[PDB]
Design an enzyme around this catalytic site. Structure first.
Site, short mmCIF file in Angstrom:
data_model
loop_
_atom_site.label_atom_id
_atom_site.label_comp_id
_atom_site.label_asym_id
_atom_site.label_seq_id
_atom_site.Cartn_x
_atom_site.Cartn_y
_atom_site.Cartn_z
CG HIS A 13 -7.83 -6.89 -9.82
ND1 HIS A 13 -6.83 -6.68 -10.75
CD2 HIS A 13 -7.73 -8.18 -9.43
CE1 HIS A 13 -6.16 -7.81 -10.92
NE2 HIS A 13 -6.68 -8.73 -10.13
CB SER B 202 -4.09 -10.44 -9.61
OG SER B 202 -4.99 -11.10 -10.48
CG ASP C 156 -5.38 -3.91 -12.13
OD1 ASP C 156 -5.96 -3.74 -11.06
OD2 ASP C 156 -4.96 -5.01 -12.48
C1 LIG Z 1 -15.30 -7.52 -16.98
C2 LIG Z 1 -14.43 -6.81 -18.02
N1 LIG Z 1 -15.04 -5.92 -18.79
N2 LIG Z 1 -13.15 -7.08 -18.22
C3 LIG Z 1 -12.27 -6.30 -19.10
C4 LIG Z 1 -11.03 -7.14 -18.96
C5 LIG Z 1 -11.03 -7.95 -17.72
O1 LIG Z 1 -10.28 -9.11 -17.74
C6 LIG Z 1 -10.48 -10.26 -16.88
C7 LIG Z 1 -10.52 -10.11 -15.49
C8 LIG Z 1 -10.70 -11.22 -14.68
C9 LIG Z 1 -10.82 -12.48 -15.27
C10 LIG Z 1 -10.90 -13.69 -14.35
C11 LIG Z 1 -9.73 -14.61 -14.64
C12 LIG Z 1 -8.33 -14.02 -14.55
C13 LIG Z 1 -7.91 -13.16 -13.51
C14 LIG Z 1 -6.57 -12.76 -13.43
C15 LIG Z 1 -5.67 -13.17 -14.42
C16 LIG Z 1 -4.33 -12.77 -14.37
C17 LIG Z 1 -3.46 -13.17 -15.39
C18 LIG Z 1 -3.92 -13.91 -16.49
C19 LIG Z 1 -3.13 -14.21 -17.59
N3 LIG Z 1 -3.64 -14.93 -18.59
N4 LIG Z 1 -1.87 -13.75 -17.64
C20 LIG Z 1 -5.23 -14.35 -16.45
C21 LIG Z 1 -6.12 -13.95 -15.48
C22 LIG Z 1 -7.43 -14.35 -15.54
C23 LIG Z 1 -12.16 -14.56 -14.34
O2 LIG Z 1 -12.47 -15.09 -13.26
O3 LIG Z 1 -12.79 -14.75 -15.38
C24 LIG Z 1 -10.79 -12.63 -16.66
C25 LIG Z 1 -10.61 -11.51 -17.47
C26 LIG Z 1 -12.51 -8.21 -17.55
#
Ligand SMILES: CC(=N)N1CC[C@H](Oc2ccc([C@H](Cc3ccc4ccc(C(=N)N)cc4c3)C(=O)O)cc2)C1
Ligand SMILES: [Ca+2]
Lengths: 55, 235
Positions: free
Chosen positions: B42, B185, B88
């Site tokens: 991503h 990421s 990913d």
């Molecule tokens: C859309 C869908 N169906 N999904 C399935 C799972 C996926 O998970 C995400 C992806 C991005 C976000 C970002 C935030 C986001 C993006 C990257 C991260 C990397 C690491 C960690 C961590 N806690 N170690 C948190 C992150 C949170 C947002 O902007 O909300 C939050 C959750 C989404």
């Protein structure tokens, strides 16, 4: 009797892969296997996975 | 990284930073060889074009050591399903070789068996990156590293509000406010075995950061090592 990559990873520095009844160690690319079949010797000046600090 | 410790001199030499056009580091990566950088699929969307910077330990000053390289080929896992975030993982091949030096070194790839067992059997791994230090907060500037314990598959599933597949694994704290966050990421989740550091996963996603009740999840490198060597040969 002898076996078990369990015991204490069969004293491999890195990869342990028990073959037949022998522990059998191997090394990551960049490490040469030391003659004792257990230790892995860095081949290059900056082997992978080692912290490049004042070591 | 929320509530980490600092990567001191030479302590995290495999940390790559992916910088976009205006030098904004939008993701991280793990140095694997003189030409290949490992990162998480991503991240390739957060810029039209980017470059990889290695040797960078502090975003702010150019204290030497930092070296930028252009990407030649971007090999992405063709099955990355954006809505699950499954598969990913992506491999970047750089145009000009990375010169190793203090703070510039490849992490080791393990093998599927002895990775599953031994590395995922260890209670703790290390994660690091120039990403958000608090959720709703600035990114980092200093390279932070954090010790993240391995979490078992069933609890991981039970906590996350989204399906965790066998290409993912959870590592983080249930209640202790510490964890990787947005902007890490593609970054390394490495595991130490007898002083050698082995890549076990890459930072994928997670519900916020250090969130009480949830864990940070990483792509399981153990399921892709063959795909990695594919692309490292080039395929
Ligand atoms: C859309 C869908 N169906 N999904 C399935 C799972 C996926 O998970 C995400 C992806 C991005 C976000 C970002 C935030 C986001 C993006 C990257 C991260 C990397 C690491 C960690 C961590 N806690 N170690 C948190 C992150 C949170 C947002 O902007 O909300 C939050 C959750 C989404
Ligand atoms: Ca700098």
């Amino acid at each position: 009797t002898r076996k078990l990559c369990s015991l204490d990873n069969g004293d491999c520095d890195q990869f342990c892969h028990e073959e037949q009844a022998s522990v059998v160690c191997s090394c990551a690319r960049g490490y040469t296997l030391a003659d004792n079949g257990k230790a892995c010797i860095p081949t290059g000046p900056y082997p992978c996975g080692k912290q490049t600090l004042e070591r | 990284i929320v509530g980490g410790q600092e990567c001191k001199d030479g302590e995290c030499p495999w940390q790559a930073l992916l910088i976009n056009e205006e030098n904004e580091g939008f993701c991280g990566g793990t140095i694997l060889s003189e030409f290949y950088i490992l990162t998480a699929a991503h991240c390739l969307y957060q810029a039209k074009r980017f470059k990889v910077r290695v040797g960078d330990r502090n975003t702010a000053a150019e204290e030497g050591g930092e070296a930028v390289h252009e990407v030649e080929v971007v090999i992405k896992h063709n099955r990355f399903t954006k809505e699950t975030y499954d598969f990913d993982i992506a491999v970047l091949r750089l145009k000009t070789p990375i010169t190793f030096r203090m703070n510039v070194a490849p992490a080791c790839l393990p093998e599927r068996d002895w990775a599953e067992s031994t590395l995922m059997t260890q209670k703790t791994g290390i994660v690091s990156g120039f990403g958000r230090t608090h959720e709703k907060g600035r990114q980092s500037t200093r390279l932070k590293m954090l010790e993240v314990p391995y979490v078992d598959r069933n609890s991981c599933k039970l906590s996350s509000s989204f399906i965790i597949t066998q290409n993912m694994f959870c590592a983080g704290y249930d209640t202790k406010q510490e964890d990787a966050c947005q902007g890490d990421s593609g970054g390394p989740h490495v595991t130490r075995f007898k002083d050698t550091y082995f890549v076990t996963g890459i930072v994928s996603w997670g519900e916020g950061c250090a969130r009480k009740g949830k864990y940070g999840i990483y792509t399981k490198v153990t399921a892709f090592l063959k795909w990695i060597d594919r692309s490292m040969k080039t395929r």
